[PDB]
Amino acid sequence: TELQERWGPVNQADGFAVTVLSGTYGDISTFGVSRNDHLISCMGIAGAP
Amino acid sequence: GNQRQGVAFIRVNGMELESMEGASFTPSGITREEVTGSRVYGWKGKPRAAKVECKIPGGGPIGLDEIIDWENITVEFQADTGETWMLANAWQADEPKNDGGEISLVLMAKQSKRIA
Amino acid sequence: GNQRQGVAFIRVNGMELESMEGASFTPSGITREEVTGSRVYGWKGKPRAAKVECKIPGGGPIGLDEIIDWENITVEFQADTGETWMLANAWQADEPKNDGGEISLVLMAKQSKRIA
Amino acid sequence: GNQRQGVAFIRVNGMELESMEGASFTPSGITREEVTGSRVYGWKGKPRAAKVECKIPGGGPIGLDEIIDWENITVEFQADTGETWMLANAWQADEPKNDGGEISLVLMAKQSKRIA
Amino acid sequence: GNQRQGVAFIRVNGMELESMEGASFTPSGITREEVTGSRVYGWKGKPRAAKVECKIPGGGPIGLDEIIDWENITVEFQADTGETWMLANAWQADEPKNDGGEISLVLMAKQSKRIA
Amino acid sequence: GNQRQGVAFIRVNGMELESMEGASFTPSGITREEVTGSRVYGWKGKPRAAKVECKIPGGGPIGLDEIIDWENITVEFQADTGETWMLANAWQADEPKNDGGEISLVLMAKQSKRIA
Amino acid sequence: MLEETEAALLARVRELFGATLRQVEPLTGTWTNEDVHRLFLAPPSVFLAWMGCGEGRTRREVESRWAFFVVAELLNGEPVNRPGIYQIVERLIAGVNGQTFGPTTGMRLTQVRNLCDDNRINAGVVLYGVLFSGTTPLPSVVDLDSLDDYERHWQTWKFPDETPEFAAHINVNQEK
Amino acid sequence: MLEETEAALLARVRELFGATLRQVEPLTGTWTNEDVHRLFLAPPSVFLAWMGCGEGRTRREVESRWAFFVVAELLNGEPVNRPGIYQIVERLIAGVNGQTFGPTTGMRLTQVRNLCDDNRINAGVVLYGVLFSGTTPLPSVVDLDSLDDYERHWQTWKFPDETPEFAAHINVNQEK
């Protein structure tokens, strides 16, 4: 909500979110299906030390 | 669709010149010529200067003196279909003459650019 | 039966060019010329380059720049009666000019072969 | 507004000369010409003298002898649109001839100045 | 292919001298004259100095004083086809006559190397 | 730019001699012949005198007696582009032939300086 | 591509003149000697009429000849607004000269006839008529689109009829 | 610029002839076979009629053809003033030749037709008709003028319809 307000055509501020998920492949797939947002990007890792 | 060239507009310094009919544009490039000897071999190059031949009504607002003092101008030949060519640093060639309310302008430039 | 040539099609790189009238084809060969002395002796040879001259509308989809940059193309002169000739590695000769929506192309090649 | 040239008046010593059609005026200046070598470079100048070509009916009050004895006169080419030019110390060039009640005068001068 | 030389570019210390219609080149080597007695008896050797003859339009960036004061330069005769000879430790010869706005000029050196 | 020299003004004591189509200049300096033995062996020096060759239409203010009586004059060869050479203590050389209404004339001096 | 061109000219006329002209309407046929007693003139108004097409430069272009028939009223031998009708004719010429109109381009003025004989003078209408010629192209060949899987190639050598047949039923995409 | 040219020609004719000509009046259309029985001739009088305009040299000028129809009376097969009518014709030609009349310039005489058939001889009128051609320009494009304070600049990037919109409402002249 905050970024879409910023990324709106009036506020003119630009923001992008970067996240990393540690888990198994199924969880990352489910999260990617769930989110569906063009302002957030995630990287999936399995068993990150 | 397959639109074809209709009227051609001749502009100098971003201002239209009244060109009556059949304004001619010759692009700058190389004039390839035959090389014939024992047998035909290929073609020979020769540099060429871009040229715009237009015809302007005499006594117009442009004036004859302003025409004959065009050492450095920027000609533009625009085809109504959309393609236009610009002459960088063109000058008046030939011998201008105001015969019968009519003048012929041969504006020649080093090279022509396919702008727009 | 004894059909004659009607329209002539000028093609470059397997694509038709709009020709108005009098698109002339001259085959590549030898120009036999007189040898006159004390009496008539025979004929003298001189190699030639095959040459197709055709008139195209300006401002068309072909464009003037692509015409003036035809160093190596493969022209084909096809008579609607059935016979056709192909120019091996032709190039644009002469001085192209876009006079009143009109351009004349003299595509000249080392040899012309009667394909098909 | 954008009036064009209509008729042109040719005067000598402040008196009209009856010019039938298409009176020609070439201004005095420089005749720029191409300079092509390894590539196109620019333009070359060459001095030119102003010229007026007018056709007068023969046998008029002007006469033929007075015409052929015009070593020093002051010609004025006036375009009816308003612009006029004056020839400084013009003289009759060419070979005058009274053919079919017609004479052609090429009044040529060192310089033409845009007075008025 | 089909790139028979018609135009050549002369260069002096990376300046690309303005050349005229006729540019001439003679590579350095051995001139092979005749040594003929009772029989043909082969040929005879003789040294030759590399020479480039070119005409320059006057009033260019180069100027004539810089021409007459050229004592140690490295010139490059490049062909439109691609034949690029180079002359090291060159010098201008003869009289740089400034006739009719053209600089008749010759530059010669003791070694000629075909680079690229 | 685009001011390649085509016309030159010759001046004597600030009089601007009436010169015809062909005007020629050779600046003073060293004429660089060759001495070649087994190898090229460089070049050899030789002095040269500044020379201006011009044709004058007769009957002008200058006259011909003043031409033949010129022993010590200051000459200035100005180019339309702007290259202006100067010769101090000059003299007319050769025979000033008055052939066909033209005064062939050559002016020679021992020094040529490029002023402005 | 004529109909698109005439629509373009009509739209241009409507934009240029607006409410000055009462109406604009294409005219079927050139102006004959009974068009005055048959049409809904409602002057002042202009009619665009296609007068045919002469041969063009190529075999794909023609020189279409259009006409603008301008109408007004001449009550009591007096034009309703002579400056108005002259301005209408002049602006129609100026705004429809050179400018392209759809596929057609190079609209060149050719003729302007007064075109007012007794039939129209006694009918109280002036009929100043403009003509135009334009380089209009011909429509291109209709394209095609279809995708069918190539599976069979049937070749038959043209032997004499009652000679035993020779053929190959290739049937590509067959694996064995 | 045709109506102004007509006004200039009429003013010049009135100035040149004055009381010699009973009246001058523009004529709707060229002279037909019935204008004699329908016009208020009141001879001697001169009528100026626009006969159209052919294509000029350029795309902004035309060759407009005007006509001067001169009327008189021929009672008992004798014109009222043969020197008078001949002088009228010659003076009208001389004073309207070459001289500019408003924007039109270079009036050139092209034809002078007798134009006196039975219809007009039986009606007691001579109709010496002069024709003229002149290089008249077309009106220029109408200028414009407006000053509105530039304050907002909305720019929308052309993404596909249902893709979330991207735009910038710039709103210049804002300070913070």
PDB file of C-alpha atoms in Angstrom, chain F:
ATOM      1  CA  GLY F   1      33.854  26.917 -44.559  1.00  0.00           C
ATOM      2  CA  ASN F   2      32.746  25.951 -48.076  1.00  0.00           C
ATOM      3  CA  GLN F   3      34.912  28.816 -49.365  1.00  0.00           C
ATOM      4  CA  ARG F   4      37.237  26.898 -51.658  1.00  0.00           C
ATOM      5  CA  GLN F   5      39.228  29.445 -53.631  1.00  0.00           C
ATOM      6  CA  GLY F   6      38.100  30.072 -57.193  1.00  0.00           C
ATOM      7  CA  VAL F   7      38.888  33.754 -57.730  1.00  0.00           C
ATOM      8  CA  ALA F   8      41.895  35.837 -56.680  1.00  0.00           C
ATOM      9  CA  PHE F   9      42.551  39.582 -56.500  1.00  0.00           C
ATOM     10  CA  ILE F  10      45.982  40.878 -57.506  1.00  0.00           C
ATOM     11  CA  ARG F  11      47.021  44.286 -56.187  1.00  0.00           C
ATOM     12  CA  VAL F  12      49.979  46.543 -56.973  1.00  0.00           C
ATOM     13  CA  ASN F  13      50.589  49.578 -54.738  1.00  0.00           C
ATOM     14  CA  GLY F  14      46.944  49.371 -53.711  1.00  0.00           C
ATOM     15  CA  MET F  15      45.561  49.470 -57.261  1.00  0.00           C
ATOM     16  CA  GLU F  16      43.936  46.004 -57.595  1.00  0.00           C
ATOM     17  CA  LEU F  17      45.106  45.123 -61.100  1.00  0.00           C
ATOM     18  CA  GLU F  18      42.320  44.002 -63.410  1.00  0.00           C
ATOM     19  CA  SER F  19      43.121  40.295 -63.764  1.00  0.00           C
ATOM     20  CA  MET F  20      41.492  37.726 -66.033  1.00  0.00           C
ATOM     21  CA  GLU F  21      40.358  34.112 -65.680  1.00  0.00           C
ATOM     22  CA  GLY F  22      43.779  32.562 -65.122  1.00  0.00           C
ATOM     23  CA  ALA F  23      45.807  33.748 -62.131  1.00  0.00           C
ATOM     24  CA  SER F  24      48.736  31.698 -60.833  1.00  0.00           C
ATOM     25  CA  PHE F  25      50.950  31.941 -57.745  1.00  0.00           C
ATOM     26  CA  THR F  26      54.167  30.225 -56.649  1.00  0.00           C
ATOM     27  CA  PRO F  27      55.457  31.223 -53.191  1.00  0.00           C
ATOM     28  CA  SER F  28      59.170  31.735 -52.687  1.00  0.00           C
ATOM     29  CA  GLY F  29      61.143  29.028 -50.922  1.00  0.00           C
ATOM     30  CA  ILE F  30      63.113  25.904 -51.857  1.00  0.00           C
ATOM     31  CA  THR F  31      62.515  23.801 -54.970  1.00  0.00           C
ATOM     32  CA  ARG F  32      63.058  20.233 -53.797  1.00  0.00           C
ATOM     33  CA  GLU F  33      64.617  18.169 -56.559  1.00  0.00           C
ATOM     34  CA  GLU F  34      66.170  14.742 -56.000  1.00  0.00           C
ATOM     35  CA  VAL F  35      69.671  13.319 -55.989  1.00  0.00           C
ATOM     36  CA  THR F  36      69.440   9.530 -56.321  1.00  0.00           C
ATOM     37  CA  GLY F  37      72.391   7.191 -56.685  1.00  0.00           C
ATOM     38  CA  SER F  38      72.224   3.502 -55.864  1.00  0.00           C
ATOM     39  CA  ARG F  39      69.497   4.327 -53.324  1.00  0.00           C
ATOM     40  CA  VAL F  40      67.043   7.225 -53.134  1.00  0.00           C
ATOM     41  CA  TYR F  41      69.433   9.253 -50.936  1.00  0.00           C
ATOM     42  CA  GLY F  42      66.880  11.878 -49.939  1.00  0.00           C
ATOM     43  CA  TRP F  43      66.438  15.154 -51.823  1.00  0.00           C
ATOM     44  CA  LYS F  44      68.403  18.284 -52.758  1.00  0.00           C
ATOM     45  CA  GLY F  45      67.584  21.945 -52.201  1.00  0.00           C
ATOM     46  CA  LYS F  46      67.336  24.742 -54.761  1.00  0.00           C
ATOM     47  CA  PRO F  47      66.168  28.361 -54.357  1.00  0.00           C
ATOM     48  CA  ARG F  48      62.914  29.602 -55.861  1.00  0.00           C
ATOM     49  CA  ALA F  49      61.580  33.109 -56.488  1.00  0.00           C
ATOM     50  CA  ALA F  50      57.994  34.188 -55.849  1.00  0.00           C
ATOM     51  CA  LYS F  51      55.997  34.506 -59.067  1.00  0.00           C
ATOM     52  CA  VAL F  52      52.506  35.799 -59.914  1.00  0.00           C
ATOM     53  CA  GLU F  53      51.170  35.183 -63.425  1.00  0.00           C
ATOM     54  CA  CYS F  54      48.102  37.194 -64.431  1.00  0.00           C
ATOM     55  CA  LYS F  55      46.300  38.403 -67.548  1.00  0.00           C
ATOM     56  CA  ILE F  56      45.074  42.006 -67.673  1.00  0.00           C
ATOM     57  CA  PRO F  57      42.409  43.300 -70.091  1.00  0.00           C
ATOM     58  CA  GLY F  58      43.916  46.175 -72.022  1.00  0.00           C
ATOM     59  CA  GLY F  59      42.685  49.737 -72.031  1.00  0.00           C
ATOM     60  CA  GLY F  60      42.178  49.892 -68.278  1.00  0.00           C
ATOM     61  CA  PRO F  61      43.534  52.478 -65.873  1.00  0.00           C
ATOM     62  CA  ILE F  62      46.807  50.573 -65.510  1.00  0.00           C
ATOM     63  CA  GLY F  63      47.984  50.875 -69.106  1.00  0.00           C
ATOM     64  CA  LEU F  64      50.912  49.101 -70.724  1.00  0.00           C
ATOM     65  CA  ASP F  65      53.707  51.685 -70.498  1.00  0.00           C
ATOM     66  CA  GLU F  66      53.328  51.662 -66.718  1.00  0.00           C
ATOM     67  CA  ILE F  67      53.570  47.865 -66.920  1.00  0.00           C
ATOM     68  CA  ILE F  68      56.831  47.907 -68.860  1.00  0.00           C
ATOM     69  CA  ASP F  69      58.219  50.654 -66.589  1.00  0.00           C
ATOM     70  CA  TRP F  70      57.739  48.718 -63.324  1.00  0.00           C
ATOM     71  CA  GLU F  71      61.097  48.165 -61.618  1.00  0.00           C
ATOM     72  CA  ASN F  72      60.335  48.299 -57.872  1.00  0.00           C
ATOM     73  CA  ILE F  73      56.743  47.686 -56.752  1.00  0.00           C
ATOM     74  CA  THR F  74      54.904  46.019 -53.871  1.00  0.00           C
ATOM     75  CA  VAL F  75      52.550  43.226 -54.941  1.00  0.00           C
ATOM     76  CA  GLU F  76      49.744  41.560 -52.988  1.00  0.00           C
ATOM     77  CA  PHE F  77      48.040  38.323 -54.052  1.00  0.00           C
ATOM     78  CA  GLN F  78      44.791  38.120 -52.072  1.00  0.00           C
ATOM     79  CA  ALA F  79      42.589  35.029 -52.195  1.00  0.00           C
ATOM     80  CA  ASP F  80      38.808  35.185 -51.951  1.00  0.00           C
ATOM     81  CA  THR F  81      39.002  32.800 -48.993  1.00  0.00           C
ATOM     82  CA  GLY F  82      41.455  35.158 -47.291  1.00  0.00           C
ATOM     83  CA  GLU F  83      44.983  33.888 -47.944  1.00  0.00           C
ATOM     84  CA  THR F  84      46.891  37.095 -48.724  1.00  0.00           C
ATOM     85  CA  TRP F  85      50.523  36.803 -49.797  1.00  0.00           C
ATOM     86  CA  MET F  86      52.761  39.849 -50.154  1.00  0.00           C
ATOM     87  CA  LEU F  87      55.838  40.464 -52.306  1.00  0.00           C
ATOM     88  CA  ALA F  88      58.243  43.321 -51.600  1.00  0.00           C
ATOM     89  CA  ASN F  89      60.502  44.827 -54.277  1.00  0.00           C
ATOM     90  CA  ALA F  90      58.949  43.013 -57.230  1.00  0.00           C
ATOM     91  CA  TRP F  91      59.443  43.487 -60.967  1.00  0.00           C
ATOM     92  CA  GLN F  92      57.665  42.501 -64.158  1.00  0.00           C
ATOM     93  CA  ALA F  93      59.383  39.673 -66.036  1.00  0.00           C
ATOM     94  CA  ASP F  94      59.262  38.168 -69.529  1.00  0.00           C
ATOM     95  CA  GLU F  95      57.673  40.025 -72.459  1.00  0.00           C
ATOM     96  CA  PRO F  96      54.337  41.785 -71.740  1.00  0.00           C
ATOM     97  CA  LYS F  97      52.651  40.653 -74.941  1.00  0.00           C
ATOM     98  CA  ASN F  98      49.474  42.549 -75.866  1.00  0.00           C
ATOM     99  CA  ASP F  99      47.827  39.678 -77.728  1.00  0.00           C
ATOM    100  CA  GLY F 100      44.142  39.797 -78.628  1.00  0.00           C
ATOM    101  CA  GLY F 101      43.188  42.552 -76.211  1.00  0.00           C
ATOM    102  CA  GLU F 102      44.879  40.790 -73.282  1.00  0.00           C
ATOM    103  CA  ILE F 103      48.057  41.788 -71.460  1.00  0.00           C
ATOM    104  CA  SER F 104      49.941  38.642 -70.498  1.00  0.00           C
ATOM    105  CA  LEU F 105      52.027  39.612 -67.492  1.00  0.00           C
ATOM    106  CA  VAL F 106      54.206  37.978 -64.843  1.00  0.00           C
ATOM    107  CA  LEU F 107      55.460  39.665 -61.663  1.00  0.00           C
ATOM    108  CA  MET F 108      58.460  38.260 -59.816  1.00  0.00           C
ATOM    109  CA  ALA F 109      59.930  38.988 -56.390  1.00  0.00           C
ATOM    110  CA  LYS F 110      62.530  37.474 -54.084  1.00  0.00           C
ATOM    111  CA  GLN F 111      60.295  37.124 -51.008  1.00  0.00           C
ATOM    112  CA  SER F 112      56.691  36.142 -50.259  1.00  0.00           C
ATOM    113  CA  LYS F 113      55.130  36.613 -46.813  1.00  0.00           C
ATOM    114  CA  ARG F 114      51.683  35.287 -45.867  1.00  0.00           C
ATOM    115  CA  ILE F 115      50.054  38.329 -44.255  1.00  0.00           C
ATOM    116  CA  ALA F 116      46.639  37.772 -42.656  1.00  0.00           C
TER     117      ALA F 116
END
